[PDB]
Protein backbone atom coordinates (compact mmCIF):
# COMPACT_ATOMS: atom_id res chain seq x y z
CA UNK A 1 0.00 0.00 0.00
CA UNK A 2 0.81 3.71 0.36
CA UNK A 3 3.39 4.85 2.91
CA UNK A 4 3.99 8.09 4.80
CA UNK A 5 6.67 9.95 6.73
CA UNK A 6 5.55 12.48 9.32
CA UNK A 7 7.15 14.66 11.99
CA UNK A 8 5.14 16.06 14.90
CA UNK A 9 6.30 19.08 16.94
CA UNK A 10 4.76 20.38 20.18
CA UNK A 11 6.05 23.51 21.97
CA UNK A 12 4.34 24.57 25.24
CA UNK A 13 5.21 27.75 27.13
CA UNK A 14 5.39 27.65 30.95
CA UNK A 15 5.42 31.20 32.34
CA UNK A 16 6.77 31.45 35.87
CA UNK A 17 8.73 28.23 35.45
CA UNK A 18 11.35 27.61 32.79
CA UNK A 19 11.69 28.24 29.07
CA UNK A 20 9.11 26.51 26.81
CA UNK A 21 9.29 22.74 26.40
CA UNK A 22 9.76 21.28 22.91
CA UNK A 23 9.00 17.70 21.87
CA UNK A 24 9.51 16.31 18.35
CA UNK A 25 8.74 12.77 17.15
CA UNK A 26 9.00 11.21 13.69
CA UNK A 27 6.85 8.44 12.20
CA UNK A 28 6.95 6.15 9.19
CA UNK A 29 3.34 4.91 8.84
CA UNK A 30 2.29 3.81 12.37
CA UNK A 31 5.86 3.19 13.60
CA UNK A 32 7.78 5.78 15.60
CA UNK A 33 11.47 5.98 14.77
CA UNK A 34 12.99 9.22 16.23
CA UNK A 35 12.39 11.61 19.16
CA UNK A 36 13.80 14.84 20.66
CA UNK A 37 12.91 16.38 24.06
CA UNK A 38 14.35 19.82 24.92
CA UNK A 39 14.05 18.96 28.65
CA UNK A 40 16.12 15.74 28.52
CA UNK A 41 19.74 15.52 29.63
CA UNK A 42 21.00 14.03 26.35
CA UNK A 43 20.18 17.01 24.07
CA UNK A 44 20.30 14.69 21.05
CA UNK A 45 17.87 13.32 18.50
CA UNK A 46 17.57 9.77 19.76
CA UNK A 47 16.58 6.53 17.94
CA UNK A 48 13.31 4.75 18.63
CA UNK A 49 13.18 1.96 16.01
CA UNK A 50 15.72 -0.84 15.32
CA UNK A 51 16.26 -0.01 11.63
CA UNK A 52 17.37 3.60 12.17
CA UNK A 53 20.43 2.83 14.35
CA UNK A 54 22.30 1.83 11.12
CA UNK A 55 22.69 5.57 10.23
CA UNK A 56 26.10 7.10 10.85
CA UNK A 57 27.03 9.98 13.14
CA UNK A 58 26.62 12.53 10.34
CA UNK A 59 22.93 11.57 10.36
CA UNK A 60 22.52 12.21 14.07
CA UNK A 61 24.63 15.39 13.94
CA UNK A 62 22.58 17.04 11.19
CA UNK A 63 19.21 15.94 12.57
CA UNK A 64 20.12 17.10 16.09
CA UNK A 65 21.42 20.44 14.82
CA UNK A 66 18.28 20.96 12.73
CA UNK A 67 15.76 19.89 15.38
CA UNK A 68 17.34 22.29 17.92
CA UNK A 69 17.05 25.19 15.49
CA UNK A 70 13.35 24.38 15.06
CA UNK A 71 12.80 24.43 18.81
CA UNK A 72 14.40 27.88 19.12
CA UNK A 73 12.34 29.19 16.23
CA UNK A 74 9.22 27.90 17.97
CA UNK A 75 10.10 29.59 21.30
CA UNK A 76 10.26 32.76 19.22
CA UNK A 77 7.02 31.84 17.46
CA UNK A 78 5.20 31.48 20.78
CA UNK A 79 6.17 35.03 21.68
CA UNK A 80 5.09 36.53 18.33
CA UNK A 81 1.68 34.87 18.48
CA UNK A 82 0.89 36.13 21.96
CA UNK A 83 1.38 39.60 20.49
CA UNK A 84 -0.90 39.08 17.48
CA UNK A 85 -3.61 37.89 19.94
CA UNK A 86 -2.88 40.37 22.81
CA UNK A 87 -2.64 37.55 25.36
CA UNK A 88 -1.13 37.95 28.81
CA UNK A 89 2.20 36.46 29.86
CA UNK A 90 0.74 34.44 32.78
CA UNK A 91 -0.93 31.97 30.41
CA UNK A 92 0.44 28.75 28.99
CA UNK A 93 0.11 28.38 25.20
CA UNK A 94 0.81 25.66 22.63
CA UNK A 95 2.21 25.44 19.11
CA UNK A 96 1.89 22.15 17.20
CA UNK A 97 3.22 21.31 13.75
CA UNK A 98 2.89 18.35 11.41
CA UNK A 99 4.81 17.99 8.14
CA UNK A 100 5.88 15.23 5.81
CA UNK A 101 5.11 13.40 2.58
CA UNK A 102 3.24 10.40 1.12
CA UNK A 103 4.34 7.92 -1.58
CA UNK A 104 2.03 5.63 -3.50
CA UNK A 105 2.43 1.84 -3.60
CA UNK A 106 4.80 2.04 -6.61
CA UNK A 107 7.10 4.36 -4.63
CA UNK A 108 6.25 7.67 -6.37
CA UNK A 109 5.43 11.06 -4.82
CA UNK A 110 1.79 11.61 -3.97
CA UNK A 111 1.41 14.50 -1.50
CA UNK A 112 3.46 16.73 0.75
CA UNK A 113 2.04 18.72 3.63
CA UNK A 114 2.66 21.11 6.50
CA UNK A 115 0.04 22.31 8.97
CA UNK A 116 0.40 24.45 12.12
CA UNK A 117 -1.97 24.86 15.04
CA UNK A 118 -2.11 27.30 17.95
CA UNK A 119 -3.85 26.34 21.22
CA UNK A 120 -5.30 23.29 19.45
CA UNK A 121 -6.95 25.02 16.45
CA UNK A 122 -5.77 25.40 12.85
CA UNK A 123 -3.42 28.32 12.37
CA UNK A 124 -1.90 28.09 8.88
CA UNK A 125 -1.48 25.27 6.38
CA UNK A 126 0.41 24.69 3.15
CA UNK A 127 -1.84 24.03 0.16
CA UNK A 128 -1.60 20.79 -1.83
CA UNK A 129 0.11 22.61 -4.71
CA UNK A 130 2.99 23.42 -2.29
CA UNK A 131 3.12 27.02 -3.50
CA UNK A 132 0.51 28.86 -1.39
CA UNK A 133 -1.04 28.75 2.07
CA UNK A 134 -4.42 28.80 3.79
CA UNK A 135 -4.83 30.83 6.98
CA UNK A 136 -7.51 30.39 9.62
CA UNK A 137 -7.96 33.93 11.03
CA UNK A 138 -6.69 37.50 10.80
CA UNK A 139 -3.48 36.94 12.79
CA UNK A 140 -2.46 34.05 10.51
CA UNK A 141 -2.88 36.22 7.40
CA UNK A 142 -0.03 38.38 8.68
CA UNK A 143 2.07 35.22 8.47
CA UNK A 144 0.59 34.42 5.06
CA UNK A 145 1.72 37.82 3.78
CA UNK A 146 5.21 37.49 5.27
CA UNK A 147 5.74 34.09 3.62
CA UNK A 148 4.46 35.39 0.29
CA UNK A 149 6.83 38.39 0.31
CA UNK A 150 9.83 36.13 0.78
CA UNK A 151 9.56 32.94 -1.27
CA UNK A 152 9.17 30.39 1.49
CA UNK A 153 7.05 27.88 -0.44
CA UNK A 154 9.85 27.04 -2.90
CA UNK A 155 11.98 26.03 0.11
CA UNK A 156 9.12 24.00 1.63
CA UNK A 157 8.52 22.46 -1.80
CA UNK A 158 12.15 21.41 -2.18
CA UNK A 159 12.15 19.43 1.04
CA UNK A 160 8.70 17.88 0.62
CA UNK A 161 9.13 16.82 -3.02
CA UNK A 162 12.82 16.03 -2.51
CA UNK A 163 14.66 14.93 0.62
CA UNK A 164 11.40 13.85 2.29
CA UNK A 165 10.35 11.33 -0.35
CA UNK A 166 13.96 10.22 -0.83
CA UNK A 167 14.55 9.42 2.84
CA UNK A 168 11.10 7.82 3.13
CA UNK A 169 12.11 5.38 0.35
CA UNK A 170 15.39 4.63 2.11
CA UNK A 171 13.64 3.99 5.44
CA UNK A 172 11.12 1.69 3.75
CA UNK A 173 13.98 -0.51 2.48
CA UNK A 174 16.18 -0.64 5.60
CA UNK A 175 13.30 -1.66 7.87
CA UNK A 176 11.60 -3.76 5.18
CA UNK A 177 10.87 -6.42 7.80
CA UNK A 178 9.26 -4.02 10.29
CA UNK A 179 7.63 -1.52 7.97
CA UNK A 180 6.34 -3.51 4.99
CA UNK A 181 4.86 -6.31 7.10
CA UNK A 182 1.20 -6.78 7.87
CA UNK A 183 0.25 -8.74 10.99
CA UNK A 184 -3.31 -10.00 10.64
CA UNK A 185 -5.51 -9.67 13.76
CA UNK A 186 -5.76 -12.56 16.24
CA UNK A 187 -9.51 -12.70 16.88
CA UNK A 188 -11.93 -14.27 19.38
CA UNK A 189 -15.21 -13.65 21.23
CA UNK A 190 -16.12 -13.35 24.94
CA UNK A 191 -19.45 -13.62 26.76
CA UNK A 192 -20.66 -11.93 29.95
CA UNK A 193 -24.05 -11.74 31.63
CA UNK A 194 -25.56 -8.31 32.26
CA UNK A 195 -28.35 -10.14 34.14
CA UNK A 196 -30.89 -12.76 33.06
CA UNK A 197 -32.56 -11.08 30.08
CA UNK A 198 -29.41 -9.70 28.38
CA UNK A 199 -25.71 -10.46 28.09
CA UNK A 200 -22.65 -8.86 26.50
CA UNK A 201 -20.97 -10.22 23.34
CA UNK A 202 -17.44 -8.92 22.84
CA UNK A 203 -15.36 -9.27 19.68
CA UNK A 204 -11.59 -8.90 19.97
CA UNK A 205 -8.86 -8.14 17.41
CA UNK A 206 -5.36 -8.38 18.84
CA UNK A 207 -1.72 -7.97 17.82
CA UNK A 208 -2.43 -6.41 14.42
CA UNK A 209 -0.44 -3.98 12.21
CA UNK A 210 -0.87 -1.45 10.63
CA UNK A 211 -3.56 0.10 12.86
CA UNK A 212 -6.38 0.54 10.35
CA UNK A 213 -9.13 -2.08 10.89
CA UNK A 214 -12.95 -2.47 10.76
CA UNK A 215 -15.02 -4.38 13.36
CA UNK A 216 -18.72 -4.46 12.55
CA UNK A 217 -21.51 -6.46 14.13
CA UNK A 218 -24.35 -7.98 12.14
CA UNK A 219 -27.39 -9.49 13.78
CA UNK A 220 -29.03 -11.37 10.87
CA UNK A 221 -27.11 -9.21 8.34
CA UNK A 222 -28.06 -5.63 9.27
CA UNK A 223 -25.07 -3.57 10.40
CA UNK A 224 -26.08 -3.46 14.08
CA UNK A 225 -25.11 -0.05 15.47
CA UNK A 226 -27.44 0.05 18.50
CA UNK A 227 -26.21 -1.25 21.88
CA UNK A 228 -22.77 -1.70 20.27
CA UNK A 229 -19.75 -0.18 21.97
CA UNK A 230 -16.63 0.38 19.86
CA UNK A 231 -13.43 1.41 21.60
CA UNK A 232 -10.75 3.60 20.07
CA UNK A 233 -7.97 1.52 18.55
CA UNK A 234 -5.11 1.39 21.06
CA UNK A 235 -1.43 0.40 21.08
CA UNK A 236 -0.21 -2.83 22.68
CA UNK A 237 3.28 -1.41 23.39
CA UNK A 238 5.26 -3.84 21.17
CA UNK A 239 4.52 -2.35 17.76
CA UNK A 240 1.01 -3.84 17.32
CA UNK A 241 -2.51 -2.60 18.06
CA UNK A 242 -5.76 -3.79 19.68
CA UNK A 243 -9.48 -3.18 19.27
CA UNK A 244 -12.79 -4.60 20.42
CA UNK A 245 -16.49 -4.09 19.82
CA UNK A 246 -19.32 -5.28 22.05
CA UNK A 247 -23.08 -5.59 21.63
CA UNK A 248 -25.75 -6.29 24.23
CA UNK A 249 -27.88 -9.28 23.20
CA UNK A 250 -30.96 -10.88 24.81
CA UNK A 251 -30.39 -14.29 26.41
CA UNK A 252 -31.07 -16.91 23.75
CA UNK A 253 -30.45 -14.81 20.61
CA UNK A 254 -26.63 -14.97 20.60
CA UNK A 255 -26.58 -17.18 17.48
CA UNK A 256 -28.17 -14.35 15.47
CA UNK A 257 -25.14 -12.12 15.98
CA UNK A 258 -21.97 -12.36 13.90
CA UNK A 259 -18.85 -10.24 14.14
CA UNK A 260 -17.08 -9.17 10.93
CA UNK A 261 -13.43 -8.14 10.77
CA UNK A 262 -11.50 -6.60 7.85
CA UNK A 263 -7.77 -5.90 7.86
CA UNK A 264 -5.01 -5.51 5.28
CA UNK A 265 -3.22 -8.65 6.54
CA UNK A 266 -6.30 -10.93 6.18
CA UNK A 267 -6.53 -13.07 3.02
CA UNK A 268 -10.32 -12.58 3.28
CA UNK A 269 -12.52 -10.80 5.83
CA UNK A 270 -13.26 -12.81 8.99
CA UNK A 271 -16.57 -13.84 10.53
CA UNK A 272 -17.07 -14.88 14.16
CA UNK A 273 -20.20 -16.27 15.82
CA UNK A 274 -20.82 -17.36 19.40
Amino acid sequence: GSHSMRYFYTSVSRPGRGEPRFIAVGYVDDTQFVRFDSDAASQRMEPRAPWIEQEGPEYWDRNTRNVKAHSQTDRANLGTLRGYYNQSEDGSHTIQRMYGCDVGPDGRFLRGYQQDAYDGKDYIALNEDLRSWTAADMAAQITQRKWETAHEAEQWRAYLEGRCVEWLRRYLENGKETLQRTDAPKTHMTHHAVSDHEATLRCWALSFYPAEITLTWQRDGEDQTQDTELVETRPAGDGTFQKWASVVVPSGQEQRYTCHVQHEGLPKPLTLRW
Binding site: F8, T10, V25, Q32, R35, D37, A117, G120, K121
Partner: peptide, 8 residues
Protein backbone atom coordinates in the same frame (compact mmCIF):
# COMPACT_ATOMS: atom_id res chain seq x y z
CA UNK B 1 6.84 10.17 23.53
CA UNK B 2 4.14 12.87 23.32
CA UNK B 3 2.43 13.03 19.93
CA UNK B 4 -0.98 14.00 18.58
CA UNK B 5 -3.80 13.06 16.18
CA UNK B 6 -5.22 14.79 13.12
CA UNK B 7 -7.65 16.85 15.27
CA UNK B 8 -4.57 18.10 17.23
Amino acid sequence: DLSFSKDW
